[PDB]
mmCIF file of C-alpha atoms in Angstrom:
data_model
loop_
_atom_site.group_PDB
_atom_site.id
_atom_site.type_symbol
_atom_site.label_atom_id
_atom_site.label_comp_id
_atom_site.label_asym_id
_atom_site.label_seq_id
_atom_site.Cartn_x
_atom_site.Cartn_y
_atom_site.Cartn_z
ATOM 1 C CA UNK A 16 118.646 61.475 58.606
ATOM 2 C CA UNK A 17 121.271 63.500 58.224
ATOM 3 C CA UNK A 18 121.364 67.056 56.361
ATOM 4 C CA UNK A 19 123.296 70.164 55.291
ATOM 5 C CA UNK A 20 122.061 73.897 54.985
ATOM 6 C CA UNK A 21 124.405 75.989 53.000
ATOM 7 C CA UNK A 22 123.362 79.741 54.421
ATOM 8 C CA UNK A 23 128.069 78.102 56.655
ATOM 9 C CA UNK A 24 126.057 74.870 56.578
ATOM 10 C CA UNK A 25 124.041 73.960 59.355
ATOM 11 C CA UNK A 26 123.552 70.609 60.380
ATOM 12 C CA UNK A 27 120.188 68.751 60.374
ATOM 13 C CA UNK A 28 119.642 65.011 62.038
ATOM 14 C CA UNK A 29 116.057 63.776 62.075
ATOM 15 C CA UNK A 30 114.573 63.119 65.350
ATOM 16 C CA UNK A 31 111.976 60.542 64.828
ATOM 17 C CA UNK A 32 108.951 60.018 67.480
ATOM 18 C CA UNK A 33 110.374 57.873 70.437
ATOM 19 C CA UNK A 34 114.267 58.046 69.498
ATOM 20 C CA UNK A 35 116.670 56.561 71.568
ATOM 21 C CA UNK A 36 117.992 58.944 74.300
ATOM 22 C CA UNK A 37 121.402 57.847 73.890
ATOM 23 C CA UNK A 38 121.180 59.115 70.194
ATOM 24 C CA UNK A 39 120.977 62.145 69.473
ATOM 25 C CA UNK A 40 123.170 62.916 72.387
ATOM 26 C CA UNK A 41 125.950 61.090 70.512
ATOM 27 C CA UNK A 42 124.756 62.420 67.186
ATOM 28 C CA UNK A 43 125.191 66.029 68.050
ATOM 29 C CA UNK A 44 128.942 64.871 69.713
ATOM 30 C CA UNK A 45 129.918 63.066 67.052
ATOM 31 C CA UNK A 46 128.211 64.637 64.020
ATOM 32 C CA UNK A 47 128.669 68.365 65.044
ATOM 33 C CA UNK A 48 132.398 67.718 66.470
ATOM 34 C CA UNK A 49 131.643 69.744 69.741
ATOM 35 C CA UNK A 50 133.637 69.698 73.035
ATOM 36 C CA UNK A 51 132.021 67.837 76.149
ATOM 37 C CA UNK A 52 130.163 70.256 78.176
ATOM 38 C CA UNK A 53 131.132 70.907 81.169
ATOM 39 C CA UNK A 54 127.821 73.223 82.440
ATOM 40 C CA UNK A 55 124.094 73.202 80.872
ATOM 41 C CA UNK A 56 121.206 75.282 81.725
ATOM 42 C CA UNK A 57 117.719 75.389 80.042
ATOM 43 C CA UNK A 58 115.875 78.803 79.107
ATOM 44 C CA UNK A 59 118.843 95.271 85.016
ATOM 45 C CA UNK A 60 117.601 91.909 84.383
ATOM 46 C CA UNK A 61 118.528 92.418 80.577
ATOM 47 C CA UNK A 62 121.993 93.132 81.401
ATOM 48 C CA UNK A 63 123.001 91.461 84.496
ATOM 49 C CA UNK A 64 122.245 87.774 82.669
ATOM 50 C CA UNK A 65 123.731 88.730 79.228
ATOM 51 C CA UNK A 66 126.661 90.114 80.650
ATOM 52 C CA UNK A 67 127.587 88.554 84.271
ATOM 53 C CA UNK A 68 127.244 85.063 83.188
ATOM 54 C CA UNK A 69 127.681 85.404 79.204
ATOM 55 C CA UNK A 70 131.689 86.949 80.388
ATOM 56 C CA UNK A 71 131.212 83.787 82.774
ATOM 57 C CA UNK A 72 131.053 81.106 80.460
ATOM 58 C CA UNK A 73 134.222 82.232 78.582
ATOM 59 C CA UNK A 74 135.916 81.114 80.920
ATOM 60 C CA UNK A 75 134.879 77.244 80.431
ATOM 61 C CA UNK A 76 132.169 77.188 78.089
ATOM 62 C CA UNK A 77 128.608 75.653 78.787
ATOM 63 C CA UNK A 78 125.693 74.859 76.749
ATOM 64 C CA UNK A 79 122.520 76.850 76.389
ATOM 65 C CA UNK A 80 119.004 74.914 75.637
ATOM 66 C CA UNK A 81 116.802 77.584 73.703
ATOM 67 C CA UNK A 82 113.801 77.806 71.177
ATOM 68 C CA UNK A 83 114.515 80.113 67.910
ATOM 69 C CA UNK A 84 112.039 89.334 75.169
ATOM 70 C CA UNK A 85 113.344 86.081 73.989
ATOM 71 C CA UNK A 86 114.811 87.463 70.692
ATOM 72 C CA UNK A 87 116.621 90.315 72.603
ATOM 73 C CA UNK A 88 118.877 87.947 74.316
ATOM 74 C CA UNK A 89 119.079 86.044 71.084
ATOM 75 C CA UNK A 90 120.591 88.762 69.447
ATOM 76 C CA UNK A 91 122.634 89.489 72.605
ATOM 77 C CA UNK A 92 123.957 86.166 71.918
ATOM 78 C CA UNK A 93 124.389 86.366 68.802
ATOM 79 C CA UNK A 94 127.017 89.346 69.440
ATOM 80 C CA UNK A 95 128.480 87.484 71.900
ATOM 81 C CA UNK A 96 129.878 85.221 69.608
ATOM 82 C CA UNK A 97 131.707 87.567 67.404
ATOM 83 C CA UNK A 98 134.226 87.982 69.877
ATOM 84 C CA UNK A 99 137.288 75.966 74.682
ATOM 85 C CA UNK A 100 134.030 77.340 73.272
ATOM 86 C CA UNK A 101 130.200 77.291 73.879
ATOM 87 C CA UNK A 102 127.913 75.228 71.398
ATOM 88 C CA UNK A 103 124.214 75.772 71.071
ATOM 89 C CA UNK A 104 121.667 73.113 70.070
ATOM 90 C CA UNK A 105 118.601 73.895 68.048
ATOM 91 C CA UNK A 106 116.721 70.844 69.836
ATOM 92 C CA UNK A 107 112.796 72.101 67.905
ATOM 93 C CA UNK A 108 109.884 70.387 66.158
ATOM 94 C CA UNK A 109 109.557 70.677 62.426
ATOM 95 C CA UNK A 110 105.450 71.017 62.885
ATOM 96 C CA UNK A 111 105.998 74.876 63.942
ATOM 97 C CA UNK A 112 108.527 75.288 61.140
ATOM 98 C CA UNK A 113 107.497 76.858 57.520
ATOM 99 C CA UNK A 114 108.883 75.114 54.544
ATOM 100 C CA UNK A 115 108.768 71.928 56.523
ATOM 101 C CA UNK A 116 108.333 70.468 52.968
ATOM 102 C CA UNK A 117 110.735 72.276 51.343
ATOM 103 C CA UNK A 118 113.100 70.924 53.712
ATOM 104 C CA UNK A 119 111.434 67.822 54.011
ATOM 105 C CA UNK A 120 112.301 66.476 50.042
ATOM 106 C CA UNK A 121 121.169 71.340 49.312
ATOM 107 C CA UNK A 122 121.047 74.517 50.684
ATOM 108 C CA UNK A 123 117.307 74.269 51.564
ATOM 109 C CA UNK A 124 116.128 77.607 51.065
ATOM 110 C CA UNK A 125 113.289 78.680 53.577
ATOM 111 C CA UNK A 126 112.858 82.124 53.477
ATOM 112 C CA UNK A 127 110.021 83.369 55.325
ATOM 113 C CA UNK A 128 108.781 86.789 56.426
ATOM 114 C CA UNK A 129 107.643 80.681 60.401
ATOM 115 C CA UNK A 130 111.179 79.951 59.855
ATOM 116 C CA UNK A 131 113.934 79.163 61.979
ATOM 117 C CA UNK A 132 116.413 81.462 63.615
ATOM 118 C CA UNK A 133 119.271 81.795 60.957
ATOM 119 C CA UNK A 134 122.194 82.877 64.002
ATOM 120 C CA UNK A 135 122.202 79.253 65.354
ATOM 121 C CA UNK A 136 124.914 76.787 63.049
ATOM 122 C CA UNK A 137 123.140 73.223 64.290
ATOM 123 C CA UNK A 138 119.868 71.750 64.875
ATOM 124 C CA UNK A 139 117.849 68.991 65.255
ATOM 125 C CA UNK A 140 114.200 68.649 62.668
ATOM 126 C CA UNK A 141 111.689 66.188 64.263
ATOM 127 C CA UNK A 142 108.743 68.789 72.249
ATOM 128 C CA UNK A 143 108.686 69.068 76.112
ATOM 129 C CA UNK A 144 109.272 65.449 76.778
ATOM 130 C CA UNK A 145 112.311 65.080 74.327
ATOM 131 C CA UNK A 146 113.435 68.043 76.850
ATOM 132 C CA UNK A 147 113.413 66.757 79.920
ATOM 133 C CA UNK A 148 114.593 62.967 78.335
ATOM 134 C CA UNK A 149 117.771 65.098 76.946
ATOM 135 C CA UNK A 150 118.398 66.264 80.536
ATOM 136 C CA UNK A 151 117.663 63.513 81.822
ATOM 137 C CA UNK A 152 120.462 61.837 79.986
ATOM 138 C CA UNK A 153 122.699 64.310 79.753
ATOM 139 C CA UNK A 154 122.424 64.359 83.888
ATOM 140 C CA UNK A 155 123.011 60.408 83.632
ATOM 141 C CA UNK A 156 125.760 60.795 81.255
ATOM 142 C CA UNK A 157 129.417 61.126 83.602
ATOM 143 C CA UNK A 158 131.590 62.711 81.440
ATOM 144 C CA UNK A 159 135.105 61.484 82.785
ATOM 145 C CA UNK A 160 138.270 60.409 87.120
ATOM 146 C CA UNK A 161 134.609 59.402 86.662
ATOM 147 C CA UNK A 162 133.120 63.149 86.291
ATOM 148 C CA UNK A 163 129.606 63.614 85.767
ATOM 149 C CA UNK A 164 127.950 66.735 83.927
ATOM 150 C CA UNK A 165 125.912 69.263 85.140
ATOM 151 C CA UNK A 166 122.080 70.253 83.803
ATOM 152 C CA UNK A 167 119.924 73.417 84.875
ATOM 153 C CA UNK A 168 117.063 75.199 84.671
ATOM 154 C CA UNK A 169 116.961 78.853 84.572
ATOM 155 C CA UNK A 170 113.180 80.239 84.620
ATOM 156 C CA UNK A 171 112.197 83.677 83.579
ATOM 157 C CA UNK A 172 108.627 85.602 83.707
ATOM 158 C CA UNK A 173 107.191 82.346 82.426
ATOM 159 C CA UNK A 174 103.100 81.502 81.083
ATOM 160 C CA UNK A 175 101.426 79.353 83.487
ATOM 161 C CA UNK A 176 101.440 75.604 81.283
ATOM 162 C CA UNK A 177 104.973 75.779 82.250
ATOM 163 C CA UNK A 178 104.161 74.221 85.910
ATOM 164 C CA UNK A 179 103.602 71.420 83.886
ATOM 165 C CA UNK A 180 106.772 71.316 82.646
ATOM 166 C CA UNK A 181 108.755 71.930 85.653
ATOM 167 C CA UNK A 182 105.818 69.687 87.577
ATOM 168 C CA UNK A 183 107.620 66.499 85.927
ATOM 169 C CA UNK A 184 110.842 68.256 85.863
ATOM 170 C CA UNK A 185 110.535 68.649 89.684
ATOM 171 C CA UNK A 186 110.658 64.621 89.664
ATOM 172 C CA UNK A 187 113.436 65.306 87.118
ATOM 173 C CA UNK A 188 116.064 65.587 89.738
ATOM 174 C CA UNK A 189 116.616 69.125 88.805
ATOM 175 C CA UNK A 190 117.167 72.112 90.993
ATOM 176 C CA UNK A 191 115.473 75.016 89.610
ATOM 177 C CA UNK A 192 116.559 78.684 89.687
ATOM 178 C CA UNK A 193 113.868 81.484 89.306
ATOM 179 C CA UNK A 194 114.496 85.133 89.336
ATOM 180 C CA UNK A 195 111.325 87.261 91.486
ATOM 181 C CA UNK A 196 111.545 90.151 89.146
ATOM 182 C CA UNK A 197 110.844 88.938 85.466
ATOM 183 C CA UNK A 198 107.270 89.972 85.411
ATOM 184 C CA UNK A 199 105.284 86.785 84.814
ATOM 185 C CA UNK A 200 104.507 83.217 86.330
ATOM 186 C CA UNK A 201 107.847 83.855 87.901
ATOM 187 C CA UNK A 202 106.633 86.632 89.957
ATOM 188 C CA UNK A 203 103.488 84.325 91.471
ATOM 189 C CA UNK A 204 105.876 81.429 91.892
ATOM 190 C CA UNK A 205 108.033 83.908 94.168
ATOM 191 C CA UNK A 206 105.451 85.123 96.112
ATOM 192 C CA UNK A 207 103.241 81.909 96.296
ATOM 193 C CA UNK A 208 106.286 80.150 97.834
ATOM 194 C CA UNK A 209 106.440 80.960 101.299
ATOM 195 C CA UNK A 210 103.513 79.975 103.447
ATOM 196 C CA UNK A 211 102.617 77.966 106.448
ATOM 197 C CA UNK A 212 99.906 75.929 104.212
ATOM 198 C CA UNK A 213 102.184 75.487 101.318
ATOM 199 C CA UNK A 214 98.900 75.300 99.718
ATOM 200 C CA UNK A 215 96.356 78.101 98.361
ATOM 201 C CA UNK A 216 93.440 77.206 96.826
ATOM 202 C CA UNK A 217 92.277 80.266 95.737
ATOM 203 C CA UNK A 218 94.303 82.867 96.919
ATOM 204 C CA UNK A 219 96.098 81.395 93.823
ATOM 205 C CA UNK A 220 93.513 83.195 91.931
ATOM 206 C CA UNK A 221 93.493 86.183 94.130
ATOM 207 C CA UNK A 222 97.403 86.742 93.004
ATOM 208 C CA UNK A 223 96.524 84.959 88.746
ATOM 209 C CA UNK A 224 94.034 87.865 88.789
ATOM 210 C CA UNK A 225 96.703 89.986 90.649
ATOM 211 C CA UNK A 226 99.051 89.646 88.295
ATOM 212 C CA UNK A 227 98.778 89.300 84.576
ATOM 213 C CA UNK A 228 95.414 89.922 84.466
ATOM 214 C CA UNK A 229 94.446 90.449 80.980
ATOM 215 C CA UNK A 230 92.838 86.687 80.052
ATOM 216 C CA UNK A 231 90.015 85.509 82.477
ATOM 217 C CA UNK A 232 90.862 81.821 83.361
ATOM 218 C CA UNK A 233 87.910 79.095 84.383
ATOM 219 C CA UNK A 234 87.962 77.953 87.862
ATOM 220 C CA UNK A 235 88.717 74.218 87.135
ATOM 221 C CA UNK A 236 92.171 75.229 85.299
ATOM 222 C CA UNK A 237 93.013 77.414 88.712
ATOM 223 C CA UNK A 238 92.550 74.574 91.026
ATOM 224 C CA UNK A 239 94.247 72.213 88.402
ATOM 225 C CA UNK A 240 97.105 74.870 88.361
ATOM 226 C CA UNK A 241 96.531 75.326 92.558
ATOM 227 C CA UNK A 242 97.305 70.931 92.998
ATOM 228 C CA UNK A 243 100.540 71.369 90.464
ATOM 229 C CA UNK A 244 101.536 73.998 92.421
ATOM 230 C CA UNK A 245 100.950 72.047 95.946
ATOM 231 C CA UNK A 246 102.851 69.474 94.212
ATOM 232 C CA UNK A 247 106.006 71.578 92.584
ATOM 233 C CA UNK A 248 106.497 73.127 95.864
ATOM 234 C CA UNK A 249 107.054 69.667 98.162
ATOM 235 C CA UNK A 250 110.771 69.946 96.609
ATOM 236 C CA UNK A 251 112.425 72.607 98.077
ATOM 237 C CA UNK A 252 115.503 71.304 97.400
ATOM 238 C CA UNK A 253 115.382 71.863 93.438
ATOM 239 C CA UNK A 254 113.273 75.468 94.595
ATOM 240 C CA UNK A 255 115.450 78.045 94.512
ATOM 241 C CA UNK A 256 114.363 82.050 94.310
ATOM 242 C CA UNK A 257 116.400 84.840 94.051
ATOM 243 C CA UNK A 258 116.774 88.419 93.443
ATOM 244 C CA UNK A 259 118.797 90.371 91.433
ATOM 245 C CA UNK A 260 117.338 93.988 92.128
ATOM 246 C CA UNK A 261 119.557 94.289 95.302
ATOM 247 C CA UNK A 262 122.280 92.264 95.386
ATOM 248 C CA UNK A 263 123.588 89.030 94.161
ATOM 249 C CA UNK A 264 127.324 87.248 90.792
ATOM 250 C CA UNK A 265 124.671 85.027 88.799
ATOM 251 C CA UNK A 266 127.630 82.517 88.975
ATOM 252 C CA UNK A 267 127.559 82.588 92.419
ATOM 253 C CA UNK A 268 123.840 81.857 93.217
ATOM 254 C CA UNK A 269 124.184 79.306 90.494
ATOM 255 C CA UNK A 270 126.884 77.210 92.070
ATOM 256 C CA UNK A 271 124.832 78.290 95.622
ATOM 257 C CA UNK A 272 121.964 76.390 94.094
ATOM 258 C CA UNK A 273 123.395 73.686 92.416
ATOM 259 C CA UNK A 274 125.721 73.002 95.608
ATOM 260 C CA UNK A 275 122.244 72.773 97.763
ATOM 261 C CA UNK A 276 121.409 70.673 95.129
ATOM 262 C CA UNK A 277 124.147 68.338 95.757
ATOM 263 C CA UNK A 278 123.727 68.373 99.107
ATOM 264 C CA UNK A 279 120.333 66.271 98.856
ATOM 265 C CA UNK A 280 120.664 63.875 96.822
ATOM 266 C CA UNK A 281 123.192 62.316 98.440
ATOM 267 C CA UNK A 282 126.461 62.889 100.749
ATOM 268 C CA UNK A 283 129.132 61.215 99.128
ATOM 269 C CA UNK A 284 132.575 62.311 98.170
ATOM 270 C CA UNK A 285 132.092 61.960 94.808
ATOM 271 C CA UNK A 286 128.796 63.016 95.164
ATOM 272 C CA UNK A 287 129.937 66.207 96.389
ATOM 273 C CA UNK A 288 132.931 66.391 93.925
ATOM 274 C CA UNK A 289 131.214 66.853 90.267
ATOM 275 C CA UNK A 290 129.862 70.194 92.435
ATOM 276 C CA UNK A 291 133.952 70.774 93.968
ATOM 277 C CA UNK A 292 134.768 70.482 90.483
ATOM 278 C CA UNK A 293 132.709 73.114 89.326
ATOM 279 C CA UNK A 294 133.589 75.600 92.241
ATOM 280 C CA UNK A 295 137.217 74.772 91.353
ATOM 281 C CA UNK A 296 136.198 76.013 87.702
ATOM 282 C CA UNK A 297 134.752 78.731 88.848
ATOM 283 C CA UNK A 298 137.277 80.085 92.213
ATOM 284 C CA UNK A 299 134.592 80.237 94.417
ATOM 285 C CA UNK A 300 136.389 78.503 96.452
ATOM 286 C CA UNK A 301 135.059 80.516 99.838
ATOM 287 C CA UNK A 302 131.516 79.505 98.495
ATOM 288 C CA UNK A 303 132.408 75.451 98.751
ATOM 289 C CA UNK A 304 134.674 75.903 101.999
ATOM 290 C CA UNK A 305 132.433 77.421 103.773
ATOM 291 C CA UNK A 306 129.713 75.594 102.198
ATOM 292 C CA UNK A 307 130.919 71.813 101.279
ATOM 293 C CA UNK A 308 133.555 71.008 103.290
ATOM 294 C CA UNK A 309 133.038 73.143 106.208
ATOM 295 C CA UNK A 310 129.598 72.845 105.912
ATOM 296 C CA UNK A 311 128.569 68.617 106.059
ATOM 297 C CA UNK A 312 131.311 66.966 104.449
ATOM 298 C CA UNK A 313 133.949 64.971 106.241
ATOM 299 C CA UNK A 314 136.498 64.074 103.410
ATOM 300 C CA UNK A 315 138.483 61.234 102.631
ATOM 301 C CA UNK A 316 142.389 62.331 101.519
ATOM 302 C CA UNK A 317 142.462 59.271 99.037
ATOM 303 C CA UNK A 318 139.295 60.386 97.513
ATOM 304 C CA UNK A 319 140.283 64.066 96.836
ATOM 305 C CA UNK A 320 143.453 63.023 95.634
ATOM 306 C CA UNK A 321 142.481 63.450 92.132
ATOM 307 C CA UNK A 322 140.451 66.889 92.852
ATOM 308 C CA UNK A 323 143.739 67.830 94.500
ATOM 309 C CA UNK A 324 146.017 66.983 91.332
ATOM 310 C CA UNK A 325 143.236 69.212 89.110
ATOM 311 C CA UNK A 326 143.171 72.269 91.801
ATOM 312 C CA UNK A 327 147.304 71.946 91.715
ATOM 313 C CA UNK A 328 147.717 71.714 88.016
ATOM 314 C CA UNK A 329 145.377 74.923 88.127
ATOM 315 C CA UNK A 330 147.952 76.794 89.911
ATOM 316 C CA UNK A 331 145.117 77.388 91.772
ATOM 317 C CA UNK A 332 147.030 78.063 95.131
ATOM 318 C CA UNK A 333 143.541 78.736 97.433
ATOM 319 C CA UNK A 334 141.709 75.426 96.989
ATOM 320 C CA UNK A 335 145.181 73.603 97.937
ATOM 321 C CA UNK A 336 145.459 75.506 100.828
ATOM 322 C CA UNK A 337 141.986 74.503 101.826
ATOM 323 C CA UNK A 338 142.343 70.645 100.305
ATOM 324 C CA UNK A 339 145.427 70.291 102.404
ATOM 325 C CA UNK A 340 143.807 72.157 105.496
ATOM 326 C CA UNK A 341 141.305 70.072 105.036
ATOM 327 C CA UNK A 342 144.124 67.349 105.791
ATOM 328 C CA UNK A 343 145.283 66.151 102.535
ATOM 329 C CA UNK A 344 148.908 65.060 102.971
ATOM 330 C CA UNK A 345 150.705 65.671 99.956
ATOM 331 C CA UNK A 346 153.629 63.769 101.361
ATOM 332 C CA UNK A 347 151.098 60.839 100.704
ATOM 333 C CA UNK A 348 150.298 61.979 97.563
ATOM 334 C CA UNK A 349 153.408 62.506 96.002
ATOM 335 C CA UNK A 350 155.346 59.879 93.910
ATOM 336 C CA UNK A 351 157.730 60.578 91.871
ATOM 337 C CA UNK A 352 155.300 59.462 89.424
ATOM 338 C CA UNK A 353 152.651 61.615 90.142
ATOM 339 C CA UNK A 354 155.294 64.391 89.780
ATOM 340 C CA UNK A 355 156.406 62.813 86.368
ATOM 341 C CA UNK A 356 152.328 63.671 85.877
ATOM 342 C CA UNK A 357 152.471 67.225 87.304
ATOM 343 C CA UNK A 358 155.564 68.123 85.140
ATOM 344 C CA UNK A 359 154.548 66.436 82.132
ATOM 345 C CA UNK A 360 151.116 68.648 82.433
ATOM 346 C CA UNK A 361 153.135 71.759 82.217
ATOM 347 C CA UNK A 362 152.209 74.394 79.594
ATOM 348 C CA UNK A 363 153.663 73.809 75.932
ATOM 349 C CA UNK A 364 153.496 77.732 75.348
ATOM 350 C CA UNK A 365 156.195 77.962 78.526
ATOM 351 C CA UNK A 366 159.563 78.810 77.772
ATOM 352 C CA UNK A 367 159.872 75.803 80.465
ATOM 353 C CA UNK A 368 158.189 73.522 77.959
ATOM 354 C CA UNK A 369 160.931 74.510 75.099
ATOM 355 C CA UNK A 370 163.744 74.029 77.488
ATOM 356 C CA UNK A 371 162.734 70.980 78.873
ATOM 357 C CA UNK A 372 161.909 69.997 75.214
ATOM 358 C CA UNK A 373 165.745 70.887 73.781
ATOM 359 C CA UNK A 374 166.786 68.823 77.075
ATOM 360 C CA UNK A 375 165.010 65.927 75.490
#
């Protein structure tokens, strides 16, 4: 079902138990008329996120999965947007929401002192599982030059059920990110990590009643939280902690991660080049050469043909230096039509294009 909220109207599409994955994902294309996205990730430390990466995304645009500490970064966001562009999806539950029958049975006026964040423009009235089926798909979904897109999840000072929720994300395929400093289930997962017995039975509770200890917790939910934990942490691959207290670029750790991600899945090519791709968007081009092709891959010229046409039509000088040291022989890539290509992909705003446009 499909609905308008005039506070500037912002869409509503009903999301009915057990809808088709495939559907709302071309609902919210379609129906909100957004671009694809070319980066996703799921929801000091106050200002290195909101401003390293929030600057970051201007640059291509990505998508942000939140729920309307939480509402300090939602106003952050919020004045982000006042000054290629980012969408956000209000992906919620309409159980939680007040005036669900107001709504329910056209500006639909819900004002309540719960109600729904009024900054986002879109959402979608029907919650974990619809989550990780979204990212799922959206992970699936190859969004070219076959180009797939990229999903991730960025955790932060999270409540324990959450394990949960990463536990089935872990078999998600999805690298996960965690900062050690956000103060809760983060901080545990960081130190919990590293040991010889990846398991701890109870020293699990020695660091639950080390940290956040205000709520006493039953011994059968500590060694139900000790096995997910046992079980989360046989992935290291999608594992990931950091620290941003020292030292980091959250765009750099990000692609670092991702990249690592890459790397296990599979070694292909193409397999590696969604990740090239997003190095390429981002210049970290020392990251990848050191990392992707310097580090496992042995590439194929013909295969990064394509990548090499994208890093060219960049102007991005570096990466070709690299893609052709890493023996790409433009003499076999050029044809006078793939110059016809390179030309014709010349900027309209150049002087260039209106000169070569009075020539035609």
């Amino acid at each position: 079902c499909k609905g308008e909220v005039n506070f500037k109207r912002s869409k509503f599409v009903k999301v009915p138990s057990n809808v088709a994955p495939s559907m709302l994902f071309e609902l919210l294309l379609t129906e909100w008329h957004l671009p694809a996205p070319n980066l996703v990730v799921s929801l000091w430390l106050r200002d290195v996120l909101r401003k390293g990466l929030v600057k970051a995304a201007q640059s291509t645009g990505a998508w942000i999965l939140t729920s309307a500490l939480a509402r300090h970064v939602g106003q952050a966001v919020r004045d982000h947007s006042l000054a290629v562009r980012v969408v956000a999806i209000g992906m919620a539950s309409l159980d939680r929401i007040l005036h669900r029958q107001l709504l329910d049975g056209t500006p639909i006026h819900y004002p309540a002192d719960c109600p729904l964040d009024s900054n986002l423009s879109h959402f979608i009235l029907v919650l974990a599982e619809l989550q990780l089926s979204l990212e799922k798909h959206i992970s699936q979904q190859r969004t070219g030059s076959s180009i797939q897109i990229p999903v991730l999840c960025l955790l932060v000072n999270g409540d324990p059920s959450t394990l949960e929720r990463m536990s089935r994300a872990v078999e998600q395929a999805a690298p996960w990110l965690i900062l050690a400093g956000s103060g809760g289930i983060a901080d545990v997962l960081a130190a919990l990590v590293g040991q010889p017995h990846l398991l701890v039975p109870q020293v699990t509770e020695k660091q639950f009643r080390e940290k956040f200890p205000s709520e006493c917790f039953s011994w059968e939910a500590i060694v139900h939280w000790t096995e997910l934990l046992q079980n989360i942490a046989a992935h290291p691959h999608l594992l990931t902690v950091y620290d941003f207290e020292q030292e980091g670029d959250l765009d750099t750790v990000i692609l670092k991660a991702l990249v690592k991600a890459c790397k296990s899945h599979s070694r292909d090519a193409q397999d590696y080049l969604d990740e090239l791709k997003l190095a390429v968007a981002w210049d970290r081009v020392d990251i990848a050469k050191s990392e992707i092709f310097n580090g496992d891959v042995e590439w194929k010229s013909c295969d990064l043909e394509e990548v090499m046409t994208d890093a060219l039509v960049s102007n991005k000088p570096d990466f070709v230096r690299l893609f052709v040291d890493s023996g790409a022989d433009m003499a076999e890539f050029l044809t006078y039509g793939r110059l016809q290509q390179l030309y014709h992909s010349v900027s309209p705003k150049s002087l260039l294009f209106e000169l070569l446009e009075r020539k035609h």
